[PDB]
Amino acid sequence: VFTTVDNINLHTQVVDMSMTYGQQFGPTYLDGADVTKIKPHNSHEGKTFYVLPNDDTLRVEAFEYYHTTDPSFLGRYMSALNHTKKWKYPQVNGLTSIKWADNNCYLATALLTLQQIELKFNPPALQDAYYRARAGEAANFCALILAYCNKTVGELGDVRETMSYLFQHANLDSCKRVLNVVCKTCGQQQTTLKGVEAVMYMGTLSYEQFKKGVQIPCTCGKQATKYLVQQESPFVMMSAPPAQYELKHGTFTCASEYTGNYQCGHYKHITSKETLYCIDGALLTKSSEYKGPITDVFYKENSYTTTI
Ligand SMILES: Cc1ccc(/C=N/O)cc1C(=O)N[C@H](C)c1cccc2ccccc12
Ligand SMILES: [Cl-]
Ligand SMILES: [Cl-]
Ligand SMILES: [Cl-]
Ligand SMILES: [Cl-]
Ligand SMILES: [Zn+2]
Ligand SMILES: [Zn+2]
Ligand SMILES: [Zn+2]
Ligand SMILES: [Zn+2]
């Protein structure tokens, strides 16, 4: 056979057929299916098995492909893959979605979002898989998202939490956010955020409203105003607890709709194209206007400076 950790560097092994894989290699998977305690069948000649890293060469190759040394990662990935490879990944409005299964509504929403914003993932394994997802084969990429986010298939998922974890694995170093804070008493303080903190705000959906200002607590004890001075990023994510919100054609890129109770509710995806499209897994509706419960909105950006 061939053992690997990255499916790029293949290492030639000949096995014994009287001994389990797990005896000879440690935990060994096949296409997501744990074959640790199984022995070699005949239709196992020259196939390729993932192995837990058990020597320095494999640890270094694993870090260089996944950007983690966590010894649980591989098995969490292979356990998610074993489901994600059985999901359906329909093309809907020229985007790869996911057919509803195992509480994946939040992954479908994340996947659709990721195909409409500009993002470079640092770990090769994520970048390679993102590319393959864009081109319709997204099983691998969904398993990796589950593994990187410390989520198992069936677990209830927040889209903002998932985007936050993915952004922390993306190149957002360039990204810069300058805010000014205005209290009557303490006065005026400016702060510079970089990376993930530069593209995410929790507390309003409206990029407009962030530019005009929003009321926040001051440590003095008064109410103060936070407004956006300077934004340097290819997008921004604007998030709030779900509430009725109107979405106008052409004024945003895409949004997360969330219906029902904390945790056990369901997401759908709103995207602005030539009209508004609602993507609910395999299902597609369209309308010229939209009002409904929204918790995330994504906007395009490059360079913004305020006129205040
Ligand atoms: C679906 C989900 C999964 C996990 C979690 C939190 N884990 O720590 C949260 C949610 C959630 O209900 N998120 C939505 C979008 C949400 C986020 C924030 C506040 C909310 C208040 C009422 C109802 C939903 C609310
Ligand atoms: Cl890293
Ligand atoms: Cl399954
Ligand atoms: Cl679901
Ligand atoms: Cl990373
Ligand atoms: Zn990294
Ligand atoms: Zn399943
Ligand atoms: Zn103050
Ligand atoms: Zn769901």
Q: Decide: 294 in ligand 1 pocket, CB within 6 A.
A: no
The total number of residues shown for the chain amounts to 308
The verdict on 80 and 1 lying in the same domain is no
Method: X-ray
What does the radius of gyration of the chain's CA atoms come to, in whole angstroms? 23
Half-sphere exposure of 249 (CA within 13 A, CB side): 9
Contacts of 212 (CB under 8 A, 6+ apart): 227
- Rounded to whole angstroms, the maximal C-alpha distance in the chain is 79
Element (H, E) at 149: helix 139-149
Each residue of 247-274: b (16+ CB within 10 Å) or e? beeeebbbbbbbeeeeeeebbbbbbbee
Q: Decide: 260 in ligand 1 pocket, CB within 6 A.
A: no
Q: Decide: 262 in ligand 1 pocket, CB within 6 A.
A: yes
Q: Is 266 a catalytic residue?
A: yes
The verdict on 236 and 184 lying in the same domain is yes
Whole-angstrom CA distances from 54 to 3, 60, 65, 123 are 11, 11, 16, 21
- For residue 149, the one-letter residue type is C
Q: Is 105 a catalytic residue?
A: yes
Q: Which of 124, 142, 175 represents a domain boundary (last residue)?
A: 175
Q: Decide: 40 in ligand 1 pocket, CB within 6 A.
A: no
The verdict on 65 and 153 lying in the same domain is yes
From 106, 205, 238, 263, mutation site for ligand 1 pocket: most ligand atoms within 8 A of C-beta: 263
Catalytic residue among 11, 44, 249, 266: 266
Residue span of the structural domain in which 129 resides: 52-175
The verdict on 61 and 130 lying in the same domain is yes
Alpha-carbon distance 99 to 115, whole Å? 17
The verdict on 85 and 209 lying in the same domain is no
Is 142 a known ligand-binding residue?
no
